[PDB]
């Protein structure tokens, strides 16, 4: 298969979880078609304005921030939503804002007061399951982070070919390899929690 | 170093001729030094290659400009959440820079309907006050009144140029894009005392 030389499935997804934890960002598909479009993935705990000025540059620039149902809840954000940082920013669409914007937003602490409406971070809510109940890209970043043991929020969007086509899985390895960036699919997730998060017995 | 551009009268000219020669301009508000810039092209020579400067270059939340006519033909929100649509028909995943540009042009063909248009999606229509930058002296006025003053079909779209750090072109960086990329710019304030002067009945 197309990833095969990258690992087995739940060796990719191990590779993916020990880059999130090093603050480096991973590439995610839905599965091992050639014509899947993949999104870059960071970490909320470890981001960057260097990361989301990559992102921006590389990606489509709708840049999405996943929380869980929890997190969303704490914002009072509805079961397009966008937000901005009320304070710490200035026009709110740099880098370094959008990254503002994203850690207040995950902020465990956080109260809807610190966000104002609209903005130019897009929030979504993973599912309650995770990729065993919806095989999003939602579920699939904020389960990333839970596995990973990190703080349950992150950030993605869809890698863009300079040309304004978007990457698909050929050019997304070859992405992945130009950023050392571990490349992985929702179905790999999927094998991966299936193996150690559900009762044997 | 505005004034490199021209006079404000001589800025908006270069800036409708780009228009009509199917090139992009820049915008900002006024000649102050800190103001952040935005992209500019019009709808009605939009390319697939022009989408994709404004995703290279830009904060990639590309905004289409509308006449309050032709958001109302497509039934958006009259003018908390944020728009966004997808064309129905002739896309994929809607987010590639053709895609965008179907679903642009999709959504200001003046013979469209509302059904044309999915929402959610990744193109982001902002409903232009009527009377332009006279009435409301924002860049989504801006962008459809330089439409309309260059005789185009009056729609454009609108994004906001980020330099390689990410941080947003400020007036400076705009002056040495627009140098670097043959686009003139100009100013809301430039635009305003333009059809003070020429759009006003004797």
């Given at each position: 298969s197309l990833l095969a030389e990258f690992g087995d499935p739940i060796t990719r997804?191990?590779?993916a979880l020990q880059?999130?934890?090093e603050g480096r960002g991973v590439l995610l598909l839905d599965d091992e078609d050639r014509e899947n479009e993949g999104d870059?993935?960071?970490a909320v705990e470890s981001l960057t304005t260097a990361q989301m000025a990559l992102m921006i540059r590389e990606c489509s620039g709708i840049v999405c921030l996943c929380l869980t149902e929890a997190q969303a809840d704490r914002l009072?954000?509805?079961?397009?939503?966008?937000?901005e940082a009320k304070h710490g920013v200035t026009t709110g669409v740099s880098a370094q804002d959008r990254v503002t914007t994203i850690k207040t937003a995950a902020n465990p602490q956080a109260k809807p007061e610190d966000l104002a409406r609209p903005g130019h971070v897009f929030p979504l809510r993973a599912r309650a399951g995770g990729?065993?109940?919806?095989?999003?890209?939602?579920?699939?970043?904020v389960d990333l982070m839970q596995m990973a043991g990190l703080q349950p929020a992150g950030v993605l969007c869809e890698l863009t070919n300079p040309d304004g086509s978007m990457a698909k899985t050929p050019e997304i390895i070859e992405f992945g390899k130009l950023h050392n960036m571990p490349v992985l699919t929702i179905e790999d997730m999927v094998q991966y929690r299936i193996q150690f998060d559900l009762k044997l017995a």
């Open positions: 997804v191990e590779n880059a999130l934890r870059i993935i960071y009072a954000l509805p079961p397009t939503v966008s937000i990729v065993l109940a919806r095989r999003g890209h939602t579920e699939g970043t």
